[PDB]
Amino acid sequence: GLVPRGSHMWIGVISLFPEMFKAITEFGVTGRAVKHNLLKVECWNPRDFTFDKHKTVDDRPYGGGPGMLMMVQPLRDAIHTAKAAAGEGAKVIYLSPQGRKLDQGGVTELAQNQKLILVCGRYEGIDERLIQTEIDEEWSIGDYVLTGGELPAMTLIDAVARFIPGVLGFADGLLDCPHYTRPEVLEGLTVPPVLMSGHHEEIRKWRLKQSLQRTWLRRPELLEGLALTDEQRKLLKEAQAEHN
Amino acid sequence: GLVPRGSHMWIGVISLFPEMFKAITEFGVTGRAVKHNLLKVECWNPRDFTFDKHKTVDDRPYGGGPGMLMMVQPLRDAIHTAKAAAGEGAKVIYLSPQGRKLDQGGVTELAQNQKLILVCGRYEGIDERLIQTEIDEEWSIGDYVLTGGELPAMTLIDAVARFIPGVLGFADGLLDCPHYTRPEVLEGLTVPPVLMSGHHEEIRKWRLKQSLQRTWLRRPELLEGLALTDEQRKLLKEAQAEHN
Numbered sequence A, B: 001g002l003v004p005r006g007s008h009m010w011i012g013v014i015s016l017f018p019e020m021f022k023a024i025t026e027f028g029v030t031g032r033a034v035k036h037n038l039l040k041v042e043c044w045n046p047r048d049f050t051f052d053k054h055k056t057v058d059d060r061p062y063g064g065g066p067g068m069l070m071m072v073q074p075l076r077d078a079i080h081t082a083k084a085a086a087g088e089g090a091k092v093i094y095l096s097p098q099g100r101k102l103d104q105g106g107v108t109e110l111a112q113n114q115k116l117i118l119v120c121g122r123y124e125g126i127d128e129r130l131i132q133t134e135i136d137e138e139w140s141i142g143d144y145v146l147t148g149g150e151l152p153a154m155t156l157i158d159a160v161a162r163f164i165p166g167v168l169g170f171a172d173g174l175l176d177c178p179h180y181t182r183p184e185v186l187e188g189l190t191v192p193p194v195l196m197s198g199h200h201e202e203i204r205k206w207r208l209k210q211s212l213q214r215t216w217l218r219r220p221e222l223l224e225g226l227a228l229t230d231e232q233r234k235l236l237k238e239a240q241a242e243h244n
Ligand SMILES: CC(C)(C)c1cccc(C(=O)NCC2(NC(=O)c3cccc4nocc34)CCCCC2)c1
Pocket: A095, A096, A097, A098, A121, A122, A123, A124, A125, A126, A139, A140, A141, A142, A143, A144, A145, A146, A147, A148, A149, A152, A153, B104, B172, B173, B174, B175, B176, B222
């Protein structure tokens, strides 16, 4: 083993649909991370923490109306069991549309935790007091309406799993340059000559320039948090001028 | 049947990991939408469109380096087969970090399509010319680094499935008011009295006010695209003043 024994990542998940998480534990990069014991994903289902015959996991809001909520007691008890399994130092995250907007800086922050517990909402969400009593942070993957927090949780797991030592073992955070692979001519469209030139120093400059221009045109906000290198500033200035 | 015969939604998916999509086709709201034939999700795997013995689906970039790309020919041919199955009028969406940022306005737009084809990238993505020759629109669920476009595609499916007639059959786009359910007192924390008052007109005003304040404090950008009602402007002004 090349990876130190205490660098694996543990993520507890609280969800009414634990089987959804097979999508990240059995496929692709995260799938290989679980199989090689770099990532452990453990799920607790609030349905298993009910005591009534029909395993009721939703409840009605005070004040009335059709917007059902997650029942407090089964959710809270699932969370308490995850905390017990985690031991000390687990950070409890509620995936929620009222949370801090997730971005790569945020992922980096979250990935500094060896132990995470992710709480996925269903119905109209969870009791506000549970946020105060059980939740450490609220995070959102975007401003759109979903039917559950499970896809956001899986998105977050995918994003932080890239930071686990053994997986793959900020300029990269800019948008990619255009990518080209075989064939040389695709329905009449040709690869930029420099890319097929074998001049790897020219290729390097070209790719960096294209990445900068594309970030500039499609996500300029990403540049606002960076003090670019001299080369990057030079290439970006060139691309900006040539774009007129 | 209460729902017209031609209002079902069809979504073709192009992905190296079709089994991931079980997470949306077999669970929750989308799961029920598929079972009741309101939503149809059909997947094509580029691996099935290869002709070499080891079913190779990645290729090397012109110009070199470790960043592998999706092999053009199997991906393109999977897309062509999805287009054939779709028939006329299917919109082809590439889930991509260089795409338009998804928000609820964007979801609403996408949901006006009866037929969508979603292309999920792996490795470092797809050949730029394929975007020109096969892709209609690029969309991104957020600014963070993922290992595949499958979770974004599923997120998008979850978001647009809410617009299908028979599922559930812009003020709602503001952040929710705080939600409260049983018990009346949770670890000493009490429900706001108005909510347990039975005064449903007071409750309505309180919930709207709280929703506005919370949108104001946590997602003010959402208010920039709306001309609020007189009641909403009155309640928001009150919450803003009382927040000092
Ligand atoms: C103004 C805005 C953002 C459009 C909005 C406004 C009001 C409600 C929602 C919404 O989607 N309620 C449903 C709910 N969503 C999420 O869990 C969720 C959604 C999006 C990004 C996320 N990241 O993590 C979790 C996320 C799932 C069921 C349990 C309650 C939360 C959205």
